[PDB]
């Protein structure tokens, strides 16, 4: 019998219960966006998780938005371009979380979000 840990394993929604994705595995998830005709975009943050500081009415949370890294990569056909930008963020913000999101211009919404980098030490 193992006890589920109570610390050190805060989560980032989809795919964050998997072992951290290798470069190969990340590339395949970005390729899924491209094949789906969804637009990749990077976000980053120094704060990893949801909280409630400014209001606490139903459906209001803080920390849902992170900060956009540059612009959505419209017309990206090469997953390696996305992974390269992840390294650029890591370079400029060594202790930031980075996630990859995806925009569906057909149902007009954000439709993907998954963690690409977590600072170790966190």
């Amino acid at each position: 019998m193992q006890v589920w840990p109570i610390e050190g394993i805060k989560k980032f929604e989809t795919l964050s219960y998997l072992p951290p994705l290798s470069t190969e595995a990340l590339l395949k998830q970005v390729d899924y966006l491209i094949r789906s005709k969804w637009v990749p975009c990077l976000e980053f943050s120094k704060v990893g998780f949801i909280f409630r500081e400014h209001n606490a009415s139903p459906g209001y949370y803080d920390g849902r938005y992170w900060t956009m890294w540059k612009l959505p990569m419209f017309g990206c056909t090469d997953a390696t371009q996305v992974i390269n930008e992840v390294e650029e963020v890591k370079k400029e913000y060594p202790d930031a979380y980075v996630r990859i999101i995806g925009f569906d211009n057909m149902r007009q919404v954000q439709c993907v979000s998954f963690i690409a980098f977590k600072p170790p030490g966190c």
């Binding site: 193992q2 006890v3 805060k10 980032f12 989809t14 795919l15 219960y17 949801i50 849902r64 979000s113």
Partner: protein, 439 residues
């Protein structure tokens, strides 16, 4: 007779109904179909002088088409058209009263089932619809790219409110998005609702603070009266929690619509449970198909709706799941879609699969419903040999492994067992779940 009008061109404002009609011996389909039309509209046994004070033709239901049912020599689908003016705006209650209020007792019929309704845009635009709907819900909860996961707390009755909330915290902290109140759990001697709401709120906020992900518990607002139902939603609102629940068939459509409006006005998600549906929707020859009850819910309003287990007929389920989620659904008899249905941008409802499912079902469920679904366990979390939090983690891991594999281009229908087996190598929680439940 005069109510069978096979040359009638349906109007884009008509409500259309497809009835599966089983007439008594000696009753041809045409007067059975015409009787359905007249009996669910203007038909009355003797003539009356007040008919001459109006133009009855304008309010006649018409049977405009009849087709045989495959495998039956005494069953037909009869299509009936009802004018827009018959119906009170914004009232599912009146729509059912007008269409299914009387005709199911007609003596010339052995049995009658309502299979489908064409809800025209002119009529559906008079309804609020879902308080939020699929897209808004994903944005509010910050949850993308996978089915949502839930667990129903058991035993439904037995626990103190505190022990109940304990089980909720342990499920949520292990990786489920939601926990749920059993349909029977409203307010009862050993667990009064307000106590349950306080302890479940403590649990929601403890698990959210621990994991960093948004959590909820479907707090059941179903009650004996409208005043009590709303008192329950008002306290959920005070507590700031994200979602409440209603049993829409046993509470009823007038109450449901009231609650859907309250939830829109106050930012609450609304989880809909379909208790009692099989009293109405089970038998193929009599009653109403669930796709009718599903359309009615989308109109009255809910953000989730229980939609089965798919573990009935695949094609029929896929059919009404589209009717629940999509903006435009083309007629498709193989999938039980009798009418083209255009929702003119009314939000969709998230279908919820529940009932006896465990980790080995995850590939099939993910493949059937795709991302916009809630997979609801209840036995498959609380039955894990290491307890609730590991049971939740096992389900969350299995799901994310299936999603990762699917996104990579792997076929979930053929490779699901291998996908799950590969995840067991690095997830001891999943490995443990996989040896208790077997396939």
């Amino acid at each position: 007779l005069t109510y069978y009008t096979p040359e009638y061109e349906t109007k884009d404002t008509d409500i259309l109904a497809a009835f599966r009609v089983s007439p008594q011996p000696g009753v041809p389909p045409e007067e059975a179909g015409a009787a359905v039309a007249a009996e669910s509209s203007t038909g009355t046994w003797t003539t009356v002088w007040t008919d001459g004070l109006t133009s009855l033709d304008r309010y006649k239901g018409r049977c405009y088409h009849i087709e045989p049912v495959a495998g039956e020599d005494s069953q037909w689908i009869c299509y009936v058209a009802y004018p827009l003016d018959l119906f009170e705006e914004g009232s599912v209650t009146n729509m059912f009263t007008s269409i299914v209020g009387n005709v199911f007792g007609f003596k010339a019929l052995r049995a009658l089932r309502l299979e489908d309704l064409r809800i025209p845009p002119t009529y559906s635009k008079t309804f609020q619809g879902p308080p939020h709907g699929i897209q808004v819900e994903r944005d509010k909860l910050n949850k993308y790219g996978r089915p949502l996961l839930g667990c129903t707390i058991k035993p439904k009755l037995g626990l103190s409110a505190k022990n109940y909330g304990r089980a909720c915290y342990e499920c949520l902290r292990g990786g489920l998005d939601f926990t749920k109140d059993d349909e029977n759990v409203n307010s009862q001697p050993f667990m009064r609702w307000r106590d349950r709401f306080v302890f479940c709120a403590e649990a929601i906020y403890k698990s959210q603070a621990e994991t960093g992900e948004i959590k909820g518990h479907y707090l059941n607002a179903t009650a004996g009266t409208c005043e009590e139902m709303i008192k329950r939603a008002v306290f959920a609102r005070e507590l700031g929690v994200p979602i409440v629940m209603h049993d829409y068939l046993t509470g009823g459509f007038t109450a449901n619509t009231t609650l859907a409006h309250y939830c829109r006005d106050n930012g609450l998600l609304l989880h809909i449970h379909r208790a009692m549906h099989a009293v109405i929707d089970r038998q193929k020859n009599h009653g109403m198909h669930f796709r009718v009850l599903a359309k009615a819910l989308r109109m009255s309003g809910g953000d989730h709706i229980h939609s089965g287990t798919v573990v009935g007929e695949r094609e029929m389920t896929l059919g009404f799941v589209d009717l629940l989620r999509d903006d435009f659904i083309e007629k498709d008899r193989a999938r039980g879609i009798f009418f083209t249905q255009d929702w003119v941008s009314m939000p969709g409802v998230i279908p919820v699969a529940s009932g006896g499912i465990h980790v080995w079902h995850m590939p099939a469920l993910t493949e059937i419903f795709g991302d916009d679904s809630v997979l609801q366990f209840g036995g498959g979390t609380l039955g894990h040999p290491w307890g609730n939090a590991p049971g939740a983690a096992a389900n969350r891991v299995a799901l994310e492994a299936c999603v990762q594999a699917r996104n990579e281009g792997r076929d979930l229908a053929r490779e699901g067992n291998e996908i799950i087996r590969a995840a067991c190598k690095w997830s001891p929680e999943l490995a443990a779940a996989c040896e208790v439940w077997k396939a």
